Structure formats: C-alpha cells, structure tokens
RNA sequence: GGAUUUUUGGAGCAUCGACCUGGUAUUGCAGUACCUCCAGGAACGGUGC
C-alpha cells in the first residue's frame, strides 16, 4: 500500500535509534526508510547523574535533514502541515 | 513461505510490538509492508524507563522491531 | 432572582423531560446489543444528570420559608410588581424572536437518524469502556487472567478450561493456600470482574448493590455464613473450624484473630472482602460466565477458517455551441445569460414577458432584441 | 473578536530568526489570551504584537515555550500564574506596556529559569531605582532591557531596601 | 419574544400569589393603566400563560420542595424506570385508543 | 553493487578511523565494491603515543567509518 | 531506481552540508561528491570527534553505513524533487 | 515454483533448521534466547527461511536487578519473534 | 527480499559550551562550523572511557 505516503509533507517526530527525537516536515521517504525533514529539529535526553537533579532535553535545530533508515526506529505525526 | 505474508494479512488488531531499544508500542496495526513497516494508529508508546505516552498514529520500521505480541483471539492456521 | 418561582419550574420541567426522554427511550424497540447498552448508558447519564438537578432543587429551600411570609402577603405586591415592568422596560431594539426557551432541552435530550446519541452524550462511545472480546456484555475477557495465574503458579498444567473449572468454584476448597500471594491476583481478577458488574448492566443501582453486598458481610459473613451438621463453624480469615457458636464468639475477640497473625482481621479483611465481592459477582454473573465458557469451546473446538471467520465478525460542446459567455439583459433585473441561443430563447419567454410587463410594454415581435429599457420605452412610444 | 483555537490554526508557523519554531500572531488585537493549548507544545516563541490584551494571563501549561512576545499591547496588570505554566521560559519581551507600580514586576521573579528581560518604553522605568528593583527582585536575569547586569548593580540592588 | 416571555412568566408569578380567582395582583393592575393584552382569553399566548400559572401552581404544591423533600424521584433509579415504564405504557394504550377510535371513525 | 569513488584516494596518504575508536593511517593502494581497503606502510595509532607499523593492512568496509585524505588528492 | 532522499542528497551536492557519523562525530564541509549508497565526500570538513573538538581535515570520506544524519542546506529547500 | 518449494522442504527437513521443524512435528517447546537477554520457552508454529518464529503459549524468562537479581517472568498466549534477535535454539530443554 | 553502505542486529581523566570582572584595537555593508588579545574568580553543564 501507500501508507508511508499519506503522512508526507506534514510535522512529524522521528525516533532515532540513540534516543534522539527529529521533528520536521517529512517531505520525502524512499523504500529504505530514509527521510528529508524540513526545518527539522533534533532533541536528545541528557542523564540527570545525581539524585537531585532533573533529566533535561537539548533541542537543536539543523533545517534540512536526509536521514537514514539504519538510525530511525519508528516516526509519529505531531502537526498539520503549515 | 515467508512469515511477513503472515503478518501482512493483519488489519484492526491491538496488538503490542515491542521494539530493539526497550519500547514497546502496543495499538491498532493498521498497515504491513513486505518490509515489515508496521503502520498502527491509537497507540500507547512505553520507552525504557520511561512513561507511556500516547499518540494518535505511529510508523514502526521492520528492522528495529525486536517481537510481536498478538491477540488470544486470532487463529494462526488461517493466516498461515 | 426568583429561586422559589422559577428556578424550581424550571428543575421540574428538566426532570419532566428527561422522563420523558427515558419512556421514549424504553417505549422504542431494539435490535442490537451494542445499541441496546449505549441506549442503556444514555438513560443512566440522563438519570444521574436528573438526580444532579433533583438535589439541586431540594436544597434551594432555606431563603423560601423566609420569603414565604412575603410572598404569600395579598395586601402588599403590585408596587413591586410596577417596579419589576419598569425594570423590564428596556430597550426593544433587539429584534431576535428566541423559541428556545423549552425547544432546547427537548432537542438536546433527543437523537438524530444518523447517529443514535443525545446531545449531552454526544462523545460516549461503547469501545471506551468495553475491549472488542467482551461484545458488549456478551462474554468475558479471561486470557489475561488465565496468563496470571499460569504466571503465579509458575506451572503450565492448566490450560483455559482448567482456569474456567477453577474458577467455577464458588465454596469449595481453594486451588492454592489463602495466605499465598495468589489471593494478590484474586483481588485483581475481581477488580475487573466487579466492573463488569458495572459494565453489564448501568441501568441498575450500583450504589445500593454495594451497600447491601456489604451489609451481607458484614452482618452474616463475619458472623459465620456457613453452618455445619470443626465443621459447624468456619472462618474465612483464620481458616479454622470451631466446636460452638459460644466458642467462635469467644474466638472471634481473640488475640490471634484480631492483630496476631498472618491472616487476622486486621490485615486480611480486604482480601475477604474481595473473595466475598468475587463470589458475589460470579453468583451474580454465571450465565455470562456460562456463556464465556461456550464460545472459548466453541472456538477451541472450532478450526482455522472457522475461527477466523468467527473473529471477523465538457468544455468542446461548450465552446462550440457559445456557451460560457456573458451576456446581459438590462430589462430583467440585469439578468446573465450563458449563450446568444439561450438569450434568444429567453427572450420569448414568460420571465421576459413578465418583466416587460411592468414597464407597459406589450409582447410583441417589434421589442424581441430589446435589451435596454431606454431603448424599450423609445420603441413603445414611437408605435 | 475574541482569540479562539481557530486564529492560531490559521496563522503561520515556522522557523524564526532565532532557529525557533515561531508563530506569528501580528494584527489580531486580542482583549485576552486563551485556548494556546491547540499547539501540542510544538512552539518556542509566541508573538503577539499589535494587540489590545490588558492582562497577560490565562496561558496554558506549555513546556516547549522558551520566548515570549507581547510588545505593542496595552498590558496594565501582569498575571502571577506564569511560572507553573512556562518552567523552561528564558526570553520575555514586555516592551510599550502600561506598567507604572513597582509592584506589577513582582510575579516576574516567580520564573527561575529567565534570563533576557525587556520592560522598555514602559513608565515604570520612568521611577527611580527601577533597574536596581528589577535586579533585587529577579536575580536570575542576566540581561534586563538589552543592558548585561553588572556586580556594582548587583551590590546596589543587595544594599537597598534592606 | 423574549421581554413579552419575561412579562408572561412575571404574571403567571404574580397571579399565583393570590388568595381568590379575581383577587389578584393583576387585576388591580388593569385598572391601574398597565396595559396587558395577555390577561384576555382571546388572545394564543394566554393559553400558554395559563399553562404557566398551572407551572406556578406547580411550584406551589407541599412535595413541589416548599415544605418537603423528594425520595423517591430524587434517590430511586428504580422508581424512575418504573414511572418511565408506566408512561411508556399509558403512551402504548393512549395509541391504542386512537388507533380504536381511527377503526371507527373508518 | 556501485564500487566507491575511490579513484582520487588511490595511491596517497590518508588516514581511515574503525570502529570502537582505532585510528590507522598508511597509502591506499586498491578498493573494493564492499568498501574494503588495502593500506601500505600502514601505522595504527592507539590510545597511547606509540604506534605500531602494520607494513600491509586489510580493512573491511563495515569497520571504516571515515576517512581523512592527509595530501592534496 | 533512485530514492528521493538520495536524490535530494546528490543535488546537495557542491553546498556546505553537515553529515553526522555513528560515533557522534558532526563534519560540516563542502559536499564535493555523493553516492547511491550515501557515501559523501567533503572538502574542508570540520569534525567534532563527540567531544566538542572542531579540527579542520581536508577531503573526508564517509561512507553510508555510519552516516546517521545529513543536514542539508536550507536553498535545497524549494527543490522540485520534494515538491 | 514447486521446485524450489521442494527444495525448501528439504532443506527444512534436513538443514539446521530441521530440530525447529521438530518443533513442527512433534509440537514441543523449544527454548530461544534473544539479544534482550529474554529466553523464551515455547513450540514454534510457523517458521521462515530468515528463522522469523510464530510462537504459542510461550514463557519469556529474564534477570532484572533492583542486591540480587531476580526471575522476572512472563507468560504471553501467541506471539511473534523476527529471526534477528535470535540467538540460540534449543530443541529439548530441560525444564 | 536473509552475507560488509540502509531491512532479518555489535548486541577520576580527556574535550567543548557557558557565568562574572578589569585594560586593549577595529566604526567596518552581508547571507555564516568559531572569531581582537591578555590577566583573574567559579561553589555551571553536554559526550566517551
């Protein structure tokens, strides 16, 4: 089918395989599960290392991103397209 | 035969996939690939350690996908 | 505000329509289970949303015995009255007539063809509450709870059947010990099964039933439910027979009974209370367990096909005949026309014959090309 | 007209200057902020310029907004439930306000986590000791009306109204 | 139509409270040049305002929640689903009768 | 089943990083479709300052994750 | 045939892009050349080494198998393959 | 075709695979370990070429540590296991 | 659709980014890994071992 297609061009979350979260509008996909997210933005937990501290998460925005389909996991939709 | 046919013929199934890195998404599949790209919707997404979130339609690859859990309710000779 | 007057008619007229919204619900025949238990749910939030306005209206009673004595006053009133109408005297330039006043609720507690829900229960639906092996109150859903138990007893020599003939039981001996950890799960088992006391019927006072289950035990079931011809008297916290009924009583104060052991009255009295809530609801729900029990035959006795069959249930003719072409004919109210065959037509027409007739112009072939009514009056006046 | 779900499904969301997700909220003339809820937390900066908001309150739990814009309004009055519904704020832009007591910039200590501050072309910079109030009552805010906080201000801040 | 529902609902109100049929608090106003066009029987809406009365009347009954509480509409679901069956089946015999009267009639 | 373009890193001296943080520097002297690479007068670098001569070295393609050409290519 | 993604990485090709390796390494250079098999060859990449420490090396080659992430250019952004 | 569905007979009647076909014959619990560290226990209903499992009333044992590590257990009616994580396949276990 | 680049699995130290003081040169028109230099205090954080 063309399930992979219906969800293109909108916001959606990819999950990395380190943990690492892309958002960005996912304009293009290909049969090895690759990815070209527009405006994407990358977030990735940080370890709290004591007992007091909180667990934070840096985000950092890249624009366009190609990713491959060795590093994603699963991808969910988040936002309509703007 | 190959066992993704199996698992292609499943439509409307709450069933729970558990990926390679402590996930498990347990929804309604709602597309398979011959890739095993499994396409759910209403899914309840528990990480490693982490809360249950919930989202309103997710897409799973083949290759990050450790196991399947399946329904008691669904015969396995037909789908075979 | 007039509580006393018309806040009370108006809580009256509420519960008067929500009774009648439930007698047009119960006078109406059903053909399926699904919809017979979401009509069943509608009727319970209709009832509750009733008991709500019902306790809203009694406890709006204090002011009125003290304004009893002024309302009811004859010789005093229309001064108040005169002041009342020159307050509504307001502006009347709000021109919108509101027939809303008692046509509101009758449509808000009512349905459409479409889809059989009422307005305020407009967002319930009948998969929130109950799995897709349930049918609605049909059956019983007991793999999760057969896995449990295969899980707890660390043994896989109990197959469902086994789990549904254990379960059958309602005061025979146990299948495991009673201060085992498997009494942990037969809280649980219970936790959903008392829900489906719930689920199964939302019509029925769940209130009322659990305070009556819990008058039977605690006026009978602590006080020795279970009378022998050791075996006259028997406790379901200790575990213990008894010689008489003066002994048990005398037993029932002890030490041991009350904080000094494992299975005392004080620690063990909610796992009683859970196995008394289960036997409860497996007396009360045997024929859905019957039930359950016949399609887990039937679709273990069933083969593949069976079974899955039982889970599966245009612009060249528009441009070559003039058409899409503006035209206009001042005469009828500047009317458009889409085609100079279509305009000619038109013209010997009764819309061009009635719109030429409130100039005073006759019809007639001289005024057949006449499109400006300058032109029209022109051409009258000259005949 | 009343800001509803409706006017920010409709209005433009995308990346700023910054390298932030912005929607841009310009021209509404808004009296009261309310339903921010319908972004599912996908935004970091929220502006909301040419509006007539007399109270900036009434926002909703939103942990992924990092900068907020409310220049050219009318806010006389500032809400005191900011901090439980933006923990990971770092920038506000209160410029052209209509704050003129002391006291209205004390809700504005509640957030921990601010940095940048903008209270200009307001009147309560027209009192004295204005800037030296800001800092003994927000010290975590390293720059206040695009100036750096200094350690000789700190010491005036510490050493008044004792 | 909502000032002229407000001044139906004030007289229907007003003439609740009085002591006799003509002893009113709206008669007294008729005579007082308060021009009312409701209180005449040929007019439509006075048949609806003298629903309303029967509605303040209604809300001047002892079980209407002036002296006394209701138990058994207000804590009884099953009393509820008793009265909703019995009009089910008055609504079912009132059918019944005029399918009757519609055979006769044919 | 494209072979790399390799053709401008033949013959000159590069330095290639393997997985679990390896560093091996030396002259390609051929490719393969597979990635994999023959390195001459290979030295390999560890965490210490010593690093050892390997003379000739043979480095499969799913190890090699970078490659810094260390002459003008 | 060719993949979109991968033909929206070979048009990135002669802009300065940013590849992301296996082993947290960012090299952010002139993309000089790709492949099918996303293996990209950058001039005067800039790598990270997953510490922070930006050195500048000079005609990198990385092959498609470590490459987690590519941040392209945002002028590829109206490309007519994306659409 | 035929051929090569005979071929695949026979190399799953004969190959490694065969004690997994054992699993076909007898209907018998075979033990597989995953790359998690989770040994399940169970028959094998359907198996492939690329040793993806469909497995029935299967047990899944692990060691979790909260100390001493304990034996975490569950107990899942049909499941399905890819060939991927599959590590070692034991016939006839011991218990 | 199973053999190295995507899909039937390798599973206290080093470095960088910040925070705050002093003196110092550049007053300059562009689509950006980072940008003047030196001295001082830190009880800040990210990654691997």
Same mark, same amino acid.
């Given at each position: 089918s063309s399930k992979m297609l219906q969800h293109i061009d909108y916001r959606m979350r990819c999950i990395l395989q380190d943990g690492r979260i892309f958002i960005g509008t996912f304009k293009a996909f290909d049969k090895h599960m690759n990815l070209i997210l527009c405006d994407c933005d990358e977030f990735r937990k940080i370890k709290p290392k004591n007992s007091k501290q909180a667990e934070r998460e840096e985000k950092r925005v890249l624009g366009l991103v190609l990713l491959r389909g060795e590093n994603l996991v699963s991808m969910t939709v988040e936002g309509p397209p703007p | 035969?190959?066992?993704?046919?199996?698992?292609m013929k499943l439509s409307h199934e709450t069933v729970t996939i558990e990926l390679k890195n402590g996930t498990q998404v347990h929804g309604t599949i709602t597309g398979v690939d011959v890739s095993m790209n499994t396409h759910l919707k209403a899914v309840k997404m528990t990480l490693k350690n982490r809360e249950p979130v919930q989202l309103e339609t997710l897409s799973i690859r083949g290759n990050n996908i450790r196991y399947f859990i399946l329904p008691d309710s669904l015969p396995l000779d037909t789908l075979l | 505000?007039?509580?006393?007057?018309?806040?009370?008619?108006?809580?009256?007229?509420?519960?008067?329509?929500?009774?009648?919204?439930?007698?047009?619900?119960?006078?109406?025949?059903?053909?399926?289970?699904?919809?017979?238990?979401?009509?069943?749910?509608?009727?319970?939030?209709?009832?509750?949303?009733?008991?709500?306005?019902?306790?809203?209206? #009694?406890?709006?009673?204090? +002011?009125? +015995?003290?304004?009893?004595?002024?309302?009811?006053?004859?010789?005093?009133?229309?001064?108040?009255?005169?002041?009342?109408?020159?307050? /509504?005297?307001?502006?009347?330039?709000?021109?919108?007539?509101?027939?809303n006043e008692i046509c509101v609720p009758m449509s808000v507690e009512f349905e459409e063809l479409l889809k059989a829900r009422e307005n305020p229960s407009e967002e319930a639906q009948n998969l929130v509450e109950f799995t897709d092996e349930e049918g609605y109150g049909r059956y019983l859903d007991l793999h999760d709870c057969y896995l449990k138990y295969i899980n707890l007893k660390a043994s896989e020599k109990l197959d469902y059947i086994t789990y549904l003939s254990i379960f059958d039981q309602l005061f025979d001996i146990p299948k495991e010990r009673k201060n085992a950890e498997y009494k942990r799960y037969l809280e649980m088992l219970l936790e959903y099964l008392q829900d489906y006391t719930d689920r199964v019927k939302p019509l029925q006072d769940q209130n009322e039933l659990f305070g009556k289950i819990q008058a039977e035990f605690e006026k009978k079931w602590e006080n020795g439910t279970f009378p022998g011809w050791e075996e006259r008297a028997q406790r379901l916290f200790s575990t213990k027979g008894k010689? /008489?009924?003066? /002994? +048990?009583?005398?037993?029932?104060?002890?030490?041991?009974?009350?904080?000094?052991?494992?299975?005392?009255?004080?620690?063990?009295?909610?796992?009683?209370?859970?196995?008394?809530?289960?036997?409860?609801?497996?007396?009360?729900?045997?024929?859905?367990?019957? /039930?359950?029990?016949?399609?887990?035959?039937?679709?273990?006795? #069933?083969?593949?096909?069976? #079974?899955?069959?039982?889970?599966?249930?245009? !612009?060249?003719?528009?441009?070559?005949?003039?058409?899409?072409?503006?035209?206009?004919?001042?005469?009828?109210?500047?009317?458009? !026309?889409?085609?100079?065959?279509?305009?000619? #037509?038109?013209?010997?027409?009764?819309?061009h014959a009635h719109g030429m007739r409130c100039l005073g112009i006759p019809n007639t072939a001289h005024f057949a090309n006449v499109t400006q009514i300058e032109d029209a009056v022109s051409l009258w006046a000259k005949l | 007209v009343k800001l509803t779900a409706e006017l920010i499904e409709q209005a433009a969301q995308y990346t700023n200057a910054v390298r932030d997700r912005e929607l841009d909220l310009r021209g509404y003339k808004i009296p009261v902020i309310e339903n921010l809820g319908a972004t599912l937390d996908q935004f970091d900066a929220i502006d909301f310029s040419d509006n007539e908001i007399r109270k900036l309150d009434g926002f909703p739990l939103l942990?992924?907004?990092?900068?907020?814009?409310?220049?050219?309004? @009318?806010?006389? @009055?500032?809400?005191?439930?900011?901090?439980?519904?933006?923990?990971?704020?770092?920038?506000?832009?209160?410029?052209?306000?209509?704050?003129?007591?002391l006291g209205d910039l004390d809700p504005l200590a509640s957030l921990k986590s601010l940095t940048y501050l903008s209270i200009l072309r307001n009147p309560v910079t027209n009192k004295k000791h204005y800037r030296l109030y800001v800092i003994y009552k927000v010290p975590q805010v390293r720059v206040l009306d695009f100036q750096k906080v200094k350690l000789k201000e700190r010491q005036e801040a510490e050493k008044m109204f004792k | 139509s909502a000032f002229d529902?407000?001044?139906?609902?004030?007289?229907?109100?007003?003439?609740?409270?009085?002591?006799?049929?003509?002893?009113?608090?709206?008669?007294?106003?008729?005579?007082? *040049?308060?021009?009312?066009?409701?209180?005449?029987?040929?007019?439509?809406?006075? *048949?609806?305002?003298?629903?309303?009365?029967?509605?303040?009347?209604?809300?001047?009954?002892?079980?209407?929640?002036?002296?006394?509480?209701?138990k058994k509409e207000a804590e009884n679901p099953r009393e509820v689903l008793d009265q909703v069956c019995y009009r089910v089946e008055w609504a079912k015999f009132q059918e019944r009768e005029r399918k009757k009267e519609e055979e006769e009639k044919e | 089943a494209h072979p790399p373009e390799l053709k401008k890193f033949m013959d000159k001296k590069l330095s290639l990083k393997?997985?679990?943080?390896?560093?091996?520097?030396?002259?390609?002297?051929?490719?393969?479709?597979?990635?994999?690479?023959?390195?001459?007068?290979?030295?390999?670098?560890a965490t210490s300052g010593q690093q050892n001569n390997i003379g000739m070295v043979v480095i499969r393609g799913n190890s090699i994750i970078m490659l810094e050409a260390l002459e003008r290519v | 045939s060719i993949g979109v993604p991968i033909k929206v990485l070979h048009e990135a090709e002669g802009h300065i892009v940013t590849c992301e390796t296996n082993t947290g390494e960012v090299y952010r250079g002139k993309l000089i050349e790709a492949e099918?098999?996303?293996?990209?060859?950058?001039?005067?990449? %800039?790598? %990270?080494?997953?510490?922070?420490?930006?050195?500048?090396?000079?005609?990198?080659?990385?092959?498609?198998?470590?490459?987690?992430?590519?941040?392209?250019?945002?002028?590829?952004?109206?490309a007519p393959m994306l659409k | 075709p035929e051929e090569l569905q005979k071929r695949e007979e026979e190399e799953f009647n004969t190959g490694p695979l065969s004690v997994l076909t054992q699993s076909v014959k007898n209907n018998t619990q075979v033990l597989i370990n995953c790359r998690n560290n989770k040994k399940l226990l169970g028959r094998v209903k359907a198996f492939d070429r690329h040793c993806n499992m469909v497995l029935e009333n299967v047990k899944e044992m692990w060691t979790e540590v909260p100390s001493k590590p304990v034996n975490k257990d569950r107990y899942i009616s049909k499941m399905f296991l890819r060939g991927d994580s599959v590590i070692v396949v034991l016939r006839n276990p011991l218990i």
């Open positions: - | 035969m190959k066992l993704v046919r199996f698992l | 505000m007039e509580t006393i007057l018309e806040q009370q008619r108006r809580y009256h007229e509420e519960k008067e329509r929500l009774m009648d919204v439930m007698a047009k619900e119960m006078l109406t025949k059903k053909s399926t289970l699904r919809d017979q238990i979401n009509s069943d749910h509608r009727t319970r939030a209709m009832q509750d949303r009733y008991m709500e306005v019902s306790g809203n209206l #009694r406890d709006l009673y204090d +002011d009125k +015995d003290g304004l009893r004595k002024e309302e009811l006053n004859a010789i005093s009133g229309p001064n108040e009255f005169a002041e009342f109408y020159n307050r /509504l005297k307001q502006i009347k330039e709000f021109h919108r007539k509101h027939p010689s /008489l009924e003066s /002994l +048990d009583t005398s037993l029932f104060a002890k030490n041991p009974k009350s904080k000094g052991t494992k299975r005392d009255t004080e620690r063990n009295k909610d796992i009683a209370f859970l196995e008394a809530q289960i036997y409860e609801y497996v007396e009360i729900l045997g024929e859905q367990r019957h /039930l359950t029990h016949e399609n887990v035959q039937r679709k273990q006795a #069933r083969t593949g096909e069976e #079974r899955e069959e039982e889970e599966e249930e245009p !612009y060249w003719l528009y441009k070559l005949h003039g058409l899409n072409i503006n035209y206009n004919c001042e005469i009828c109210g500047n009317y458009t !026309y889409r085609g100079p065959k279509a305009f000619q #037509r038109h013209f010997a027409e009764w819309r | 942990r992924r907004l990092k900068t907020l814009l409310v220049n050219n309004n @009318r806010i006389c @009055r500032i809400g005191e439930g900011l901090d439980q519904a933006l923990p990971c704020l770092t920038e506000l832009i209160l410029t052209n306000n209509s704050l003129v007591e | 529902l407000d001044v139906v609902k004030l007289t229907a109100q007003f003439v609740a409270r009085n002591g006799r049929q003509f002893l009113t608090q709206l008669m007294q106003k008729e005579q007082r *040049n308060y021009q009312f066009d409701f209180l005449r029987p040929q007019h439509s809406l006075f *048949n609806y305002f003298t629903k309303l009365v029967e509605q303040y009347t209604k809300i001047l009954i002892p079980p209407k929640g002036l002296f006394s509480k209701l | 393997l997985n679990g943080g390896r560093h091996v520097q030396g002259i390609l002297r051929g490719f393969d479709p597979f990635m994999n690479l023959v390195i001459d007068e290979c030295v390999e670098m | 099918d098999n996303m293996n990209c060859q950058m001039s005067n990449i %800039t790598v %990270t080494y997953r510490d922070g420490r930006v050195a500048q090396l000079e005609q990198v080659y990385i092959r498609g198998s470590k490459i987690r992430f590519l941040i392209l250019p945002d002028m590829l952004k109206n | -």
